[PDB]
Design a protein around this motif. Structure first.
Motif, PDB file in Angstrom:
ATOM      1  N   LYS A 198       0.833  -1.193   0.000  1.00 44.96           N
ATOM      2  CA  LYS A 198       0.000   0.000   0.000  1.00 44.96           C
ATOM      3  C   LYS A 198       0.872   1.248   0.000  1.00 44.96           C
ATOM      4  O   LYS A 198       1.942   1.256   0.608  1.00 44.96           O
ATOM      5  CB  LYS A 198      -0.921   0.015   1.210  1.00 44.96           C
ATOM      6  N   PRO A 199       0.448   2.299  -0.664  1.00 45.03           N
ATOM      7  CA  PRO A 199       1.288   3.489  -0.846  1.00 45.03           C
ATOM      8  C   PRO A 199       1.437   4.351   0.404  1.00 45.03           C
ATOM      9  O   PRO A 199       1.226   5.559   0.373  1.00 45.03           O
ATOM     10  CB  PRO A 199       0.560   4.242  -1.962  1.00 45.03           C
ATOM     11  N   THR A 200       1.824   3.726   1.509  1.00 37.72           N
ATOM     12  CA  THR A 200       2.068   4.493   2.719  1.00 37.72           C
ATOM     13  C   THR A 200       3.332   5.328   2.627  1.00 37.72           C
ATOM     14  O   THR A 200       3.579   6.147   3.516  1.00 37.72           O
ATOM     15  CB  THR A 200       2.150   3.566   3.921  1.00 37.72           C
ATOM     16  N   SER A 201       4.138   5.130   1.592  1.00 40.39           N
ATOM     17  CA  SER A 201       5.320   5.941   1.353  1.00 40.39           C
ATOM     18  C   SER A 201       5.663   5.852  -0.125  1.00 40.39           C
ATOM     19  O   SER A 201       5.253   4.902  -0.807  1.00 40.39           O
ATOM     20  CB  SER A 201       6.497   5.481   2.223  1.00 40.39           C
ATOM     21  N   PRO A 202       6.378   6.841  -0.659  1.00 33.71           N
ATOM     22  CA  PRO A 202       6.737   6.788  -2.080  1.00 33.71           C
ATOM     23  C   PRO A 202       7.568   5.578  -2.442  1.00 33.71           C
ATOM     24  O   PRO A 202       7.441   5.067  -3.558  1.00 33.71           O
ATOM     25  CB  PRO A 202       7.512   8.093  -2.292  1.00 33.71           C
ATOM     26  N   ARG A 221       7.202   2.652  -1.209  1.00 27.45           N
ATOM     27  CA  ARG A 221       6.343   1.482  -1.156  1.00 27.45           C
ATOM     28  C   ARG A 221       5.228   1.526  -2.176  1.00 27.45           C
ATOM     29  O   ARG A 221       4.576   0.504  -2.390  1.00 27.45           O
ATOM     30  CB  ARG A 221       5.715   1.333   0.229  1.00 27.45           C
ATOM     31  N   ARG A 222       4.984   2.679  -2.794  1.00 28.00           N
ATOM     32  CA  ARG A 222       3.831   2.808  -3.677  1.00 28.00           C
ATOM     33  C   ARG A 222       3.818   1.747  -4.769  1.00 28.00           C
ATOM     34  O   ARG A 222       2.762   1.200  -5.097  1.00 28.00           O
ATOM     35  CB  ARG A 222       3.803   4.193  -4.306  1.00 28.00           C
ATOM     36  N   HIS A 223       4.974   1.442  -5.347  1.00 25.52           N
ATOM     37  CA  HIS A 223       5.034   0.580  -6.519  1.00 25.52           C
ATOM     38  C   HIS A 223       5.584  -0.805  -6.228  1.00 25.52           C
ATOM     39  O   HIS A 223       5.764  -1.589  -7.159  1.00 25.52           O
ATOM     40  CB  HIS A 223       5.864   1.246  -7.613  1.00 25.52           C
ATOM     41  N   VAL A 224       5.841  -1.137  -4.966  1.00 27.36           N
ATOM     42  CA  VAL A 224       6.401  -2.439  -4.640  1.00 27.36           C
ATOM     43  C   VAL A 224       5.346  -3.515  -4.839  1.00 27.36           C
ATOM     44  O   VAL A 224       4.209  -3.388  -4.372  1.00 27.36           O
ATOM     45  CB  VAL A 224       6.931  -2.450  -3.204  1.00 27.36           C
ATOM     46  N   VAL A 225       5.713  -4.571  -5.554  1.00 27.20           N
ATOM     47  CA  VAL A 225       4.930  -5.796  -5.640  1.00 27.20           C
ATOM     48  C   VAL A 225       5.843  -6.927  -5.211  1.00 27.20           C
ATOM     49  O   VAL A 225       6.918  -7.111  -5.792  1.00 27.20           O
ATOM     50  CB  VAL A 225       4.395  -6.044  -7.055  1.00 27.20           C
ATOM     51  N   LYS A 226       5.437  -7.673  -4.195  1.00 24.77           N
ATOM     52  CA  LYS A 226       6.271  -8.736  -3.665  1.00 24.77           C
ATOM     53  C   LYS A 226       5.585 -10.079  -3.847  1.00 24.77           C
ATOM     54  O   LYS A 226       4.356 -10.175  -3.852  1.00 24.77           O
ATOM     55  CB  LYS A 226       6.598  -8.512  -2.193  1.00 24.77           C
ATOM     56  N   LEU A 235      10.472  -4.368  -7.874  1.00 26.34           N
ATOM     57  CA  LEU A 235      11.334  -3.982  -6.765  1.00 26.34           C
ATOM     58  C   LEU A 235      10.878  -2.685  -6.115  1.00 26.34           C
ATOM     59  O   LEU A 235      11.075  -2.498  -4.912  1.00 26.34           O
ATOM     60  CB  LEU A 235      12.777  -3.867  -7.239  1.00 26.34           C
ATOM     61  N   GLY A 236      10.290  -1.775  -6.883  1.00 25.28           N
ATOM     62  CA  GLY A 236       9.658  -0.602  -6.329  1.00 25.28           C
ATOM     63  C   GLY A 236      10.570   0.547  -5.972  1.00 25.28           C
ATOM     64  O   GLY A 236      10.108   1.689  -5.938  1.00 25.28           O
ATOM     65  N   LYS A 237      11.843   0.301  -5.699  1.00 23.59           N
ATOM     66  CA  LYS A 237      12.720   1.386  -5.295  1.00 23.59           C
ATOM     67  C   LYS A 237      14.161   0.984  -5.556  1.00 23.59           C
ATOM     68  O   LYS A 237      14.467  -0.183  -5.793  1.00 23.59           O
ATOM     69  CB  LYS A 237      12.507   1.747  -3.831  1.00 23.59           C
ATOM     70  N   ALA A 238      15.044   1.978  -5.519  1.00 18.68           N
ATOM     71  CA  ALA A 238      16.450   1.739  -5.807  1.00 18.68           C
ATOM     72  C   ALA A 238      17.119   0.912  -4.726  1.00 18.68           C
ATOM     73  O   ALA A 238      18.022   0.117  -5.015  1.00 18.68           O
ATOM     74  CB  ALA A 238      17.177   3.063  -5.971  1.00 18.68           C
ATOM     75  N   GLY A 239      16.710   1.098  -3.477  1.00 20.65           N
ATOM     76  CA  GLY A 239      17.270   0.302  -2.410  1.00 20.65           C
ATOM     77  C   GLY A 239      17.006  -1.173  -2.584  1.00 20.65           C
ATOM     78  O   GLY A 239      17.826  -2.001  -2.195  1.00 20.65           O
ATOM     79  N   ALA A 240      15.864  -1.525  -3.162  1.00 20.97           N
ATOM     80  CA  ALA A 240      15.562  -2.930  -3.380  1.00 20.97           C
ATOM     81  C   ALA A 240      16.593  -3.572  -4.291  1.00 20.97           C
ATOM     82  O   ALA A 240      17.016  -4.707  -4.056  1.00 20.97           O
ATOM     83  CB  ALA A 240      14.161  -3.078  -3.959  1.00 20.97           C
TER      84      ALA A 240
END
Ligand SMILES: [Mg+2]
Ligand SMILES: [Mg+2]
Ligand SMILES: [Mg+2]
Ligand SMILES: [Mg+2]
Ligand SMILES: [Mg+2]
Ligand SMILES: [Mg+2]
Ligand SMILES: [Mg+2]
Ligand SMILES: [Mg+2]
Ligand SMILES: [Mg+2]
Ligand SMILES: [Mg+2]
Ligand SMILES: [Mg+2]
Ligand SMILES: [Mg+2]
Ligand SMILES: [Mg+2]
Ligand SMILES: [Mg+2]
Ligand SMILES: [Mg+2]
Ligand SMILES: [Mg+2]
Ligand SMILES: [Mg+2]
Ligand SMILES: [Mg+2]
Ligand SMILES: [Mg+2]
Ligand SMILES: [Mg+2]
Ligand SMILES: [Mg+2]
Ligand SMILES: [Mg+2]
Ligand SMILES: [Mg+2]
Ligand SMILES: [Mg+2]
Ligand SMILES: [Mg+2]
Ligand SMILES: [Mg+2]
Ligand SMILES: [Mg+2]
Ligand SMILES: [Mg+2]
Ligand SMILES: [Mg+2]
Ligand SMILES: [Mg+2]
Ligand SMILES: [Mg+2]
Ligand SMILES: [Mg+2]
Ligand SMILES: [Mg+2]
Ligand SMILES: [Mg+2]
Ligand SMILES: [Mg+2]
Ligand SMILES: [Mg+2]
Ligand SMILES: [Mg+2]
Ligand SMILES: [Mg+2]
Ligand SMILES: [Mg+2]
Ligand SMILES: [Mg+2]
Ligand SMILES: [Mg+2]
Ligand SMILES: [Mg+2]
Ligand SMILES: [Mg+2]
Ligand SMILES: [Mg+2]
Ligand SMILES: [Mg+2]
Ligand SMILES: [Mg+2]
Ligand SMILES: [Mg+2]
Ligand SMILES: [Mg+2]
Ligand SMILES: [Mg+2]
Ligand SMILES: [Mg+2]
Ligand SMILES: [Mg+2]
Ligand SMILES: [Mg+2]
Ligand SMILES: [Mg+2]
Ligand SMILES: [Mg+2]
Ligand SMILES: [Mg+2]
Ligand SMILES: [Mg+2]
Ligand SMILES: [Mg+2]
Ligand SMILES: [Mg+2]
Ligand SMILES: [Mg+2]
Ligand SMILES: [Mg+2]
Ligand SMILES: [Mg+2]
Ligand SMILES: [Mg+2]
Ligand SMILES: [Mg+2]
Ligand SMILES: [Mg+2]
Ligand SMILES: [Mg+2]
Ligand SMILES: [Mg+2]
Ligand SMILES: [Mg+2]
Ligand SMILES: [Mg+2]
Ligand SMILES: [Mg+2]
Ligand SMILES: [Mg+2]
Ligand SMILES: [Mg+2]
Ligand SMILES: [Mg+2]
Ligand SMILES: [Mg+2]
Ligand SMILES: [Mg+2]
Ligand SMILES: [Mg+2]
Ligand SMILES: [Mg+2]
Ligand SMILES: [Mg+2]
Ligand SMILES: [Mg+2]
Ligand SMILES: [Mg+2]
Ligand SMILES: [Mg+2]
Ligand SMILES: [Mg+2]
Ligand SMILES: [Mg+2]
Ligand SMILES: [Mg+2]
Ligand SMILES: [Mg+2]
Ligand SMILES: [Mg+2]
Lengths: 93, 271, 46
Positions: free
Chosen positions: B6-10, B12-17, B204-209
């Motif tokens: 859920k988009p509780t943060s930018p 996390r908005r696009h993360v699919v796991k 992955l949703g973000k660069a840290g991933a």
RNA sequence: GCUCGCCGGAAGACCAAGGGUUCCUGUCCAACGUUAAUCGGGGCAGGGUGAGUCGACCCCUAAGGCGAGGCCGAAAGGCGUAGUCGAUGGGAAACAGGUUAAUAUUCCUGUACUUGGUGUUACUGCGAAGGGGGGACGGAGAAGGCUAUGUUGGCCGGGCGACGGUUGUCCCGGUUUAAGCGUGUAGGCUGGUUUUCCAGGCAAAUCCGGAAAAUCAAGGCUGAGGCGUGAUGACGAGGCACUACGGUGCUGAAGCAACAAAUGCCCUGCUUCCAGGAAAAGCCUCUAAGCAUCAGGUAACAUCAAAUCGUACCCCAAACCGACACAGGUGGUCAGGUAGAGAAUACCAAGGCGCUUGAGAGAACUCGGGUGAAGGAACUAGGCAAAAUGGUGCCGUAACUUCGGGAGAAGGCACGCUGAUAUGUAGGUGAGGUCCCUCGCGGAUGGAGCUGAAAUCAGUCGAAGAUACCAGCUGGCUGCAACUGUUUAUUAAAAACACAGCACUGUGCAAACACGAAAGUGGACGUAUACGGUGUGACGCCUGCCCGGUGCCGGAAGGUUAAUU
RNA sequence: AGGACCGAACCGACUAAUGUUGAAAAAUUAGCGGAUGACUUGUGGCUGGGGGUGAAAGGCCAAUCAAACCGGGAGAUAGCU
């Protein structure tokens, strides 16, 4: 057994100072300058065989030489070993 | 399964796991573990020879049995496990003689299933047979290239190989790439597809991933100076060049395969 | 601020000491040059 | 010496790294110290560093290094197997008090502990370069039980106050004690036990793994703290006697309880998540060869040994890195009171300092601040700078939106002290007592004592009650970049780079590709749901026409065309 | 839960003033950004000069970088001062 000439070489001189005196009259300890490579066992055997006393423990420390100036010339005294030899409370060298 | 965050943060908005409830939640099997420290893409000269590699989470290597040569002794699947070293899941199986081994988990393999390798094994997923005993048209994975060497084709999650023909001492396979290849009929294969077929649906949703997986940033060639890349330089955004690698080889369409040794085994290129 | 010389005896020895010099023919040539010049201190060891 | 001021999550204390005598005492003031110097981290002389338990050394390994043979290379050399090194990690053991001018967990006093070697005694299957177990491992979160520690009370000693009052519900001080040993508690984990068998653990194994029965149903492992002892001891406020004004000797009261409470311990625990979280030895155990009433092993007792090197001193600094006694930099540990959410901040304790030129004067001007009539951005490239906002609780809050946000939107109200509710409430803790029993570190009841919000009502002082320090300015329109990040160390932090996502393209594994005259290595102990390269850059709607030029891909009839002959 | 929020330690360096023979060959003061992470930091190790490394500025590689430093060719050459 440690040889007689080894024993006759390990001891060098008694150390004279106020701390050495206080140790002698308070804890029955004599302070000696010993050979730089003398071990505790060698010191114990040597003092027992050359002063006719009983020793329970020896404590050793290496003293580092002082860097000195002798007419703007760099010198350095030699490192030596100092031994704290405790006697068996009845010996009184 | 596949769940959107859920988009509780930018971040996390696009993360699919992809979450598997069946995976064992405890520690792995200690006897089958080894150390494997990281390289950073550096070789024994200390030089970066493969770019874009470094950091990431510490991992321990799970010794996976790719050979499947304990013939005639049935084994039972104890649990499914997470393997950080590959995209597929590894199943810890137990043989009737008290030996435990890690194998690649095929699709549909749940705990308690029976597997067996050998010339006389049944034709069911998880069983390893020589491809001369495997019927044509069958879907296999963990395919061998040389007899007794170990499976090498179709080992990633969701992949498989189709046996399309058998003519004499060679079987014809269709690899995932679309290439038609010949391999000796005495090589082994495991029936069924590799599990974890939903691995490709993750985001992955973000660069840290991506940094967690040991992947370092990619700098575009066109953003460099000419001393650095053939694409470098410019006042503003200029390209005016035919695209190439950092070492000057054309990089859009120019083929690079050169192996006359193995040319004979390729029935048809992947196209 | 943080200057360039951050002393560390272990690193100093491991990178410029007598045994590090002797480990390679170039280091031995360095030692030979310093001996020929007559340096009173061949290496950082002393 | 007496006042004053400053720091007090440091400007105090202890270490590591680094330095090396700067440490202590006597003596001197030439030079050094940004001034003087009787002083000094200065000169000269002398003294000072005590370990079986702290650290190194030592055993064991990581990254990595070296590397017998080996493979490779004009030479030099490169790589690497067996090995052997390499901590920043794993591995046995000591605490309290006293003492020097300078050392102390090292010396002394008291009380302990570890390992190994011998020697007896008793019993006995011992044995590894091999097998198994263990060592042995992430992030985040939550709670319970504790302690360090603090506060108050009780107790003991002292006091009765330079100016109104102060024999009390008054003031000041103290009220401390370790390792070890015994017990085994809150908690955590785990079903035990005995047989029989077996394609497994390179051979063997009674060990591990697996299989089948029977049986018991509670057994084991781990574990902070407390309690007892250690300890009739030590320490102890003071008092008494002195050198000689530094300090010496003797004696020595009380030494309890309640409450609060960690970021420390139980806890390498428990719950949960995905990005799936060292190695080897010490250690326990199993056997092989072998030895076989010998060795060897176990236990008790005695004895011996535990070497060598470091240990002074600085250590957020005048001693280290910055040429300086330089507004700089430097890893870890400790963590008192009042207020506070707090390791912020203010004032203080312990402790440490007043920063190695001063004395006057009270011009312009410069620097750092305070206040300012009326006006309030008219300043200026630009509200630069300054001013302003600022806490907690409650009420209330728009467009837009990817439905999470926007949002602390905006805006407003209350806020001190006293009394009552209630001589201190709700809540927390919880003694005595009583009872029970699988009787003790137990359960039930019970409420003494201690601690203690928040609220309402009434009153009351001031101009002002979030009174100091501390502590968001807010709103509207729009360009760019989706966002968190990164960058020109030392004039550019951005709209640049990266990014998740997208696409094209290469790569069938001895992969493409890259480093290498090579051997090799990375890719990868990966296998097309993978890996490399290139462009674009979340997301939404989309991505139109051109293959003439250049490039690439495919074709191979024909023309042309090298060495060679 | 979170490359979530406010905010010390810690990491950084947006603005202004001072300083510019400085206290300092890049700092001080007042504000400022991140502050559970693509975080930060200790110790040790590896990559070497047409080479390394570079979330890319031609940045950094010992106050030196459109090709480091040291020694040598070397008294390079200099129709120029
Ligand atoms: Mg010693
Ligand atoms: Mg890449
Ligand atoms: Mg990319
Ligand atoms: Mg550019
Ligand atoms: Mg390069
Ligand atoms: Mg070019
Ligand atoms: Mg342009
Ligand atoms: Mg153009
Ligand atoms: Mg040192
Ligand atoms: Mg001196
Ligand atoms: Mg002094
Ligand atoms: Mg003096
Ligand atoms: Mg002077
Ligand atoms: Mg004078
Ligand atoms: Mg001096
Ligand atoms: Mg002793
Ligand atoms: Mg130790
Ligand atoms: Mg090694
Ligand atoms: Mg080598
Ligand atoms: Mg050789
Ligand atoms: Mg070793
Ligand atoms: Mg270490
Ligand atoms: Mg250790
Ligand atoms: Mg001292
Ligand atoms: Mg073992
Ligand atoms: Mg560990
Ligand atoms: Mg953890
Ligand atoms: Mg307590
Ligand atoms: Mg206590
Ligand atoms: Mg009294
Ligand atoms: Mg009076
Ligand atoms: Mg009192
Ligand atoms: Mg068994
Ligand atoms: Mg006690
Ligand atoms: Mg914390
Ligand atoms: Mg000390
Ligand atoms: Mg300090
Ligand atoms: Mg000064
Ligand atoms: Mg300083
Ligand atoms: Mg710091
Ligand atoms: Mg405080
Ligand atoms: Mg406050
Ligand atoms: Mg403070
Ligand atoms: Mg203060
Ligand atoms: Mg004080
Ligand atoms: Mg003035
Ligand atoms: Mg002014
Ligand atoms: Mg003002
Ligand atoms: Mg005015
Ligand atoms: Mg006014
Ligand atoms: Mg106005
Ligand atoms: Mg205005
Ligand atoms: Mg104007
Ligand atoms: Mg104007
Ligand atoms: Mg204007
Ligand atoms: Mg401003
Ligand atoms: Mg202001
Ligand atoms: Mg407010
Ligand atoms: Mg808006
Ligand atoms: Mg508000
Ligand atoms: Mg109550
Ligand atoms: Mg309590
Ligand atoms: Mg517009
Ligand atoms: Mg415009
Ligand atoms: Mg941006
Ligand atoms: Mg930002
Ligand atoms: Mg920066
Ligand atoms: Mg700059
Ligand atoms: Mg390879
Ligand atoms: Mg772009
Ligand atoms: Mg065409
Ligand atoms: Mg062509
Ligand atoms: Mg954050
Ligand atoms: Mg700047
Ligand atoms: Mg600042
Ligand atoms: Mg800040
Ligand atoms: Mg923020
Ligand atoms: Mg913040
Ligand atoms: Mg060169
Ligand atoms: Mg440029
Ligand atoms: Mg530089
Ligand atoms: Mg050049
Ligand atoms: Mg020449
Ligand atoms: Mg030259
Ligand atoms: Mg010349």
């Amino acid at each position: 057994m440690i040889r007689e000439e080894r024993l006759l070489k390990v001891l060098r001189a008694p150390h004279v100072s106020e701390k050495a005196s206080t140790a002698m009259e308070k804890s029955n300890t004599i302070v000696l300058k010993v050979a730089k490579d003398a071990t505790k066992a060698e010191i114990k055997a040597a003092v027992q065989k050359l002063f006719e006393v009983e020793v329970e423990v020896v404590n050793t420390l290496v003293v580092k030489g002082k860097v000195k100036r002798h007419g703007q010339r760099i010198g350095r005294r030699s490192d030596w070993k100092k031994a704290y030899v405790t006697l068996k409370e009845g010996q009184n060298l | 399964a596949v769940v959107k965050c859920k988009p509780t943060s930018p971040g996390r908005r696009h993360v699919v796991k992809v979450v598997n409830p069946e995976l064992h939640k405890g520690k792995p099997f200690a006897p089958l573990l080894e150390k494997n420290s990281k390289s950073g893409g550096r070789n024994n000269n200390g030089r970066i020879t493969t770019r874009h590699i470094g950091g990431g989470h510490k991992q321990a290597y799970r010794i996976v049995d790719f050979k499947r040569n304990k013939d005639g002794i049935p084994a039972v699947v104890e649990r499914l496990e997470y393997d950080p070293n590959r995209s597929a899941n590894i199943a810890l199986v137990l043989y009737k003689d008290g030996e435990r081994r890690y194998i690649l988990a095929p699709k549909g393999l749940k705990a308690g299933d029976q597997i067996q390798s050998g010339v006389d094994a049944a034709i069911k997923p998880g069983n390893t047979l020589p491809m001369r005993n495997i019927p044509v048209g069958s879907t296999v994975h963990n395919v061998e290239m040389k007899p007794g060497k170990g499976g090498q084709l179709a080992r990633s999650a969701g992949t498989y190989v189709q046996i399309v023909a058998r003519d004499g001492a060679y079987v014809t396979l269709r690899l995932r790439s679309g290439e038609m290849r010949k391999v000796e009929a005495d090589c082994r294969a495991t029936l069924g597809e590799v599990g974890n077929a939903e691995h490709m649906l993750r985001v992955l949703g973000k660069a840290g991933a991506a940094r967690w997986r040991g992947v370092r940033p990619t700098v575009r060639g066109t953003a460099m100076n000419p001393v650095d890349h053939p694409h470098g330089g410019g006042e503003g955004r200029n390209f005016g060049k035919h695209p190439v690698t950092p070492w000057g080889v054309q990089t859009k369409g120019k083929k690079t395969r050169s192996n006359k040794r193995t040319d004979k085994f390729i029935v048809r290129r992947r196209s | 601020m943080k200057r360039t010389f951050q002393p560390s005896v272990l690193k100093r020895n491991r990178s410029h000491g007598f045994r590090a010099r002797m480990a390679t023919k170039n280091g031995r040539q360095v030692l030979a040059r310093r001996r020929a010049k007559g340096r009173a201190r061949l290496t950082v060891s002393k």
